[PDB]
Amino acid sequence: QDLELPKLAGTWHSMAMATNEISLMATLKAPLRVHITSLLPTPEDNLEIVLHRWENNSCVEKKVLGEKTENPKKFKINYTVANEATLLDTDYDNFLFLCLQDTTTPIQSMMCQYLARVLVEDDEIMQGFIRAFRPLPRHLWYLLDLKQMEEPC
Amino acid sequence: QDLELPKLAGTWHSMAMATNEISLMATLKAPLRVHITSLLPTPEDNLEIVLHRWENNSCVEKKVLGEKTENPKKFKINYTVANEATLLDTDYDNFLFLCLQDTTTPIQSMMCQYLARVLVEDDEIMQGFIRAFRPLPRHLWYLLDLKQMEEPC
C-alpha cells in the first residue's frame, strides 16, 4: 500500500476514538475531543482536514491544514496540542485510522480516530483499530465507542 | 446457559474494563478502578469476589461478598458506589464479563470487566465484550485496554 492520497478525499464519519492520555479526550472541552468529517487532499499533496467539535456551548466546524512531509502518511499541523497528523491505515472505501499527535514530548501524546465512509459497525475493523494502537504504543489506552447522533456534533 | 456457579471458581485476570461514566474509572483513586483476581462461590450460592486496587500509594487486596438474588447472574453487594454485581456472560474456561453497578440512580452507572483465565488476547471475545455493553446501554462507553504488568496492581 503506497498511499494514494486522492482516494481518501471526501466525507468520513467517526466510529471510535482512542487516546493514551484520557484528558485529551474525556470532556467535550478536551483538546482532541473532535470529529473529523472530511478530508480534502490538495494538488500540492497537502491535506485539508475538516472537523467538528463542541466549543462555547455549540457545535462548530474547524479547518486544519496539513503540510506534506517526506513521509506520505505524515503531515505537519497546528491544532491545540497536536503538531502532526498521521494516516495510519486505510482501505479507502470503508475505513481510515487517523491520528493527531504531539511529537514534542518524550512520550508522544496522541488521539487516533476510526473513521468510516458509512455508518456500519464492523468487527474486523474495530478489532484492527485496537490492534493498531496496541503493539509499540505499549501503555494503557482509552477507547471511546461512539453512538449515532448522541454526540452533539 | 443456565449459570453453573461452581465453574466460575478460581483465578481470573482483567484484560479490559468499560464504563459509561469515565470518572468511575479514569484514575487509580477512582471508585471502580479495580481488578478482579478471583471468584469463590459459596455453598449457599453466594459469591466471594477478590479484587486488587491502588489505595494510599500501594497495591491492596479487597474482599467483596455478594448475596444471591432470584436472578442467578445478579448479586447484592456494597463496594464504593456499586450495590450490585452481574455475571453478564461467560464460557467458564476462557472468559467472564462481570459488571459492578449502581442501580440507585435512574441512569445506571456501571463498570464491566473482561476477565480471562489466562493472559491471551482474543479478537472474538474482545469484540464480544464491546458488543455486550453496546445494545441497550446506548450511551457513549469508555473502554480501558490494559497491558501486562504496566498497571501496578
Give the DSSP per-residue string, A96-113.
EEEEEEE-SSSS-EEEEE
Report yes or no: B9 and B37 within 8 Å, Cβ to Cβ.
Answer: no
Compare CB distances from B142 to A127, A138, A142 and report the shortest one's residue.
A142
Q: Which three cell numbers stand for residue A41?
A: 487532499
Say yes or no: A135 contacts chain B, CB-CB below 8 A. no
Query: How close B6 comes to chain A (CA, Å)?
Result: 32
Any idea which fold B1-153 has?
A: Lipocalin (2.40.128)
Q: Which three cell numbers stand for residue B62?
A: 479487597
Q: Which three cell numbers stand for residue A10?
A: 471526501
Q: Which three cell numbers stand for residue A81?
A: 496540542
Report yes or no: B34 and B55 within 8 Å, Cβ to Cβ.
Answer: no
Residues of chain B with C-beta less than 8 angstroms from the C-beta of A146: 140
- Taking the C-alpha atoms of residue A61 and residue B140, their distance in angstroms, rounded to an integer, is 21
Q: What is the DSSP letter of A81?
A: T
Side chain identity at residue A99, one-letter code: C
Residues of chain A with C-beta less than 8 angstroms from the C-beta of B125: none
**Where do the structural domains in chain B lie, given as residue ranges?**
1-153
Query: How close A6 comes to chain B (CA, Å)?
Result: 32
Q: Give the torsion sign (CA, B87, B32, B63, A140).
A: positive
Say yes or no: A151 contacts chain B, CB-CB below 8 A. yes
Q: Which three cell numbers stand for residue B122?
A: 482474543
- Taking the C-alpha atoms of residue B10 and residue B117, their distance in angstroms, rounded to an integer, is 9
Query: How close B140 comes to chain A (CA, Å)?
Result: 5
DSSP per position, chain B: ----GGGG-EE-EEEEEEESSGGGTSSTTSTT--EEEEEEE-TTS-EEEEEEEE-SSSEEEEEEEEEE-SSTTEEEEEETTEEEEEEEEE-SSSEEEEEEEE-SSSS-EEEEEEEESSS---HHHHHHHHHHHSSSS-S-EEEEE--TTTS--
Instruction: Give which of B133, B141, B149 to mutate to test A binding, by max A Cβ within 10 Å.
Output: B141
Element (H, E) at A62: strand A59-68
Chain center to CA of B73: 12
**Residue A33: which of A22, A46, A41 has the closest Cα?**
A22
- 3-class secondary structure, A23: helix
- 3-class secondary structure, A22: helix
CB atoms within 10 A of CB B123: 14
Say yes or no: A141 contacts chain B, CB-CB below 8 A. yes
Q: How buried is B21 (Cβ within 10 angstroms: 0-12 exposed, 13-18 middle, 19+ buried)?
A: buried
- 3-class secondary structure, A126: helix
**Residue B133: which of B2, B27, B21, B31 has the closest Cα?**
B21
**Residue A39: which of A61, A65, A16, A4 has the closest Cα?**
A65
Task: Tell me whether strands A141-145 and B141-145 are parallel, antiparallel or unpaired.
Answer: antiparallel
Say yes or no: A130 contacts chain B, CB-CB below 8 A. yes
> What's the residue count for chain B?
153
Say yes or no: A149 contacts chain B, CB-CB below 8 A. no
B20 Cβ contact list (under 8 Å, min separation 6): B107, B109, B110, B133, B137, B139, B140, B141, B142
Terminal Cα-to-Cα distance of chain A (whole angstroms): 33
Say yes or no: A22 contacts chain B, CB-CB below 8 A. yes
- Taking the C-alpha atoms of residue B57 and residue B28, their distance in angstroms, rounded to an integer, is 10
Contacts 24+ apart (CB under 8 A), B131-135: B132/B88, B132/B89, B132/B97, B133/B18, B133/B20, B134/A145
- Taking the C-alpha atoms of residue B36 and residue B15, their distance in angstroms, rounded to an integer, is 10
- Taking the C-alpha atoms of residue A126 and residue A121, their distance in angstroms, rounded to an integer, is 8
Nearest residue of B to residue A126 by CA position? B127
Side chain identity at residue B151, one-letter code: E
Residue A91 sits at φ, ψ, to 5 deg, of -115, 10
- 3-class secondary structure, A66: strand
Angle at A17 between CA A15 and CA A23, to 5 degrees: 150
Report yes or no: B19 and B25 within 8 Å, Cβ to Cβ.
Answer: yes
CB atoms within 10 A of CB B113: 26
- Taking the C-alpha atoms of residue A29 and residue A89, their distance in angstroms, rounded to an integer, is 28
Q: What is the DSSP letter of A118?
A: S
Chain center to CA of B151: 16
Chain center to CA of B21: 15
Instruction: Give which of A20, A33, A107, A130 to mutate to test B binding, by max B Cβ within 10 Å.
Output: A130
